[model samples]
Target: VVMTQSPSTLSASVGDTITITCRASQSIETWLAWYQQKPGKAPKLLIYKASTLKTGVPSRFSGSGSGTEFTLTISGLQFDDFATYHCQHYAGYSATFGQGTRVEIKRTVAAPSVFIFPPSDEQLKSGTASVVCLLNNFYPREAKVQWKVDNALQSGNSQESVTEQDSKDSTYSLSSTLTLSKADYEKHKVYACEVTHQGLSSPVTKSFNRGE
Candidate 1:
């Protein structure tokens, strides 16, 4: 019954065809609908019953697939087509909209703000200390966060959260927390949080040390 959409945002040029995908947790048949939305406006129904085009909707907007998987395709993108799209499903009583996918037209590239916060003094009271890396305001959703110690890659123990999106700007933000034993936290001279994302030419890293 849960629905998922990807990628969180899509950047494209005019006349480029793009497809947005939706997935349902279980088979839900053709009881699905797709809609187009712009910021500060109501959603416009595009397709209903899996692949049927809603009356008055543009022919360029088409949908296919069924059951657990579905796709909404824009035959040729236009300037006005730059907006968010979402999929909805209906049952006997409940209806839900998948998190929308935003379509952007030749958007300016923006890199995420990368910062690493050292563990708080209170956190040090526990057996392990946790350091956090924040990746904020990035585009697309393809990004990686890694923890390193003394220039050596550490075993990945990042408690990464699902990425958060800004609906207005369609930017993505994510956080990853790495935990280490208090002994290791004190022993390590240098720790780094490396953030690699599609928007950036190279990896952006932030370092942390015991004193600063």
Candidate 2:
């Protein structure tokens, strides 16, 4: 599904409120959700099923829409509320996330740093396998990160990107999933993480073996 946004980037100070609109090319009224992530923490689902608030979400998080256009609004931005927000649709088999708009304390300084954190051994081997990627200290947005298994790109997994602010820093984080069978997880294979940023030296890669 194709997702479009207005203003793509938003700027606001602490204690203020802002709203971001995510529109799908086709009808996705009932399949929409909203997510928010703070610096140093994993992304959390804020709103689901258009306007329904996910369990444990703060009162400030709310969403409303029908058909194609959906809005995610934070009633009052808190100190740790400065981060990227995303609108997601789960109607189709594969979920899609918006490009993300950053909420910052103030627009100053060069782009922030990018940090990636994959799942730890314990988390991966648990009953439900999941991996997470994080981009922190980045501003104005610069690049995309890709995950590969056995030297090939993963397919059908959902993708999400968001930004968040703390009293000290701003962050961007993206997540990809790999649903593998028992045999696939037991086989020895090379998993790679590559980052692509324009005008930079070259893509940086970090490799690891799953069953080594």
Candidate 3:
């Protein structure tokens, strides 16, 4: 299957409206999905099967059309709605996305302000050690978090944060924690966290150092 997004690029701000088209190599009915992606973050599921909005997404975002031609629209775009959009189709074997189309001159927001917390001395000396990271107040609403030990990326004993609204500010928040060995913490030779957000030129990192 093939996908396409017209205009090649979209330039707009909040409260603006734009239309994207996704055409397939062959008819696939509603067997399509719309995704939104920001730089470095994971793509989000906006619509499934051509027109069904994903749970928890804003109502202003909607999908229309069927078969080979489909449309995804943001009636009145918001800060969180500014990002590249892609449409994917499933027909026989592989599925692919439309060439990513970015929303330029977006309502730029701050990158995530990250804070890292290491486990207390007692916990570090005896039980397992842990590193908790808080990343909040970021916009474009999408981000990626990773943990490294002594510069080597490792996975396991980790928790993922769910993105949601901040009632008073409307900004979003996400937090995660990683557990490591007590020995690693005592020496303070390991443990680093990095976050990627749309507005950043490069991923921001936070590391733990001993005897500071």
Candidate 4:
């Protein structure tokens, strides 16, 4: 038998330490590997054969432990580093991986500020408006954004992006834009953006009243 994460989940920020444990039923520590995964993305190989970090992976990651006990440690987690991590073993032809630990932001943070110039005049009369959700000084390069109006889920051409160059703090400023047509501004009621990440306790949410 192979190993699985003990705590099952971890939330962390930059300059923080993250430790994930994997325990096997037999001696296979030397056959270990580690992976990082995000929703809808491929699992990234981070370590192999116990303690070797994969090339291009930042120096902050490491693997150790032996016998039935194994560990993967990451120092000073990066802002773009939001994902689940798990361990695997190639002890035999039948390889295996742990269920994985959910790793995200540990710090208390509100949803990013929501803003838009509120296109004046007949701009919204076109039955459409675009609103931006601004998130700065946050971890996770890829942010998931959801939209709602009048307490109802809205879906349409939405976009998310990392803005400009990385800042002095090593975190990127990010934004998610929600676009759609509104038949009535008075009936718009409310516009809201929900930002979610493993690092977040729940979707950090920001909302605005309808009209300029």
Best by lDDT: 1
Per-candidate TM-score against the hidden true structure = 0.56, 0.51, 0.56, 0.51
Name the lDDT value of residue 98 in candidate 1: 92
Off by over 4 Å in 3: 1-22, 29-67, 72-107, 183-188, 210-212
Q: Put down candidate 1 lDDT per residue, 1-212, tens digits, no spaces.
A: 89999888788888999999999999999999998888779989999999999889989999998879999999989878888899999888999889989887555566889988989888787768889999887776668888888998977566887443455676777889989889878988898999898788898889977767
Best-to-worst ranking by lDDT: 1, 3, 4, 2
| Regions of model 4 farther than 4 Å from truth | 107-212
- Higher TM-score: candidate 1 or 4? 1
lDDT for each residue of candidate 2 in 36-147, tens digit (9 for 90 to 100): 8766778888889999998778898888898999888888888667667778889556888888776666545433244444445675567444555554555545566777
Candidate 4 residue lDDT tens string, 1-212? 85767767575667788788998878874888889887778989999888988899888898898877888888878867767888888855698878888775654433344344344446567667667777776554456778777888766667877753344533446777776566544567677877776567777777877753
Model 1 clashing residue pairs (backbone): none
For each candidate, what is the lDDT?
0.85, 0.68, 0.78, 0.72
What is candidate 3's lDDT per residue for 83-171, written digit by digit as tens? 78988885577788888777654344768889888788787667787679899787766789998878888677789775654545546
Question: Which pairs clash inside model 4?
Answer: 104-198, 104-199, 105-199, 127-181, 127-182
Give Cα distance to truth, residue 107, candidate 3, Å.
Answer: 4.1
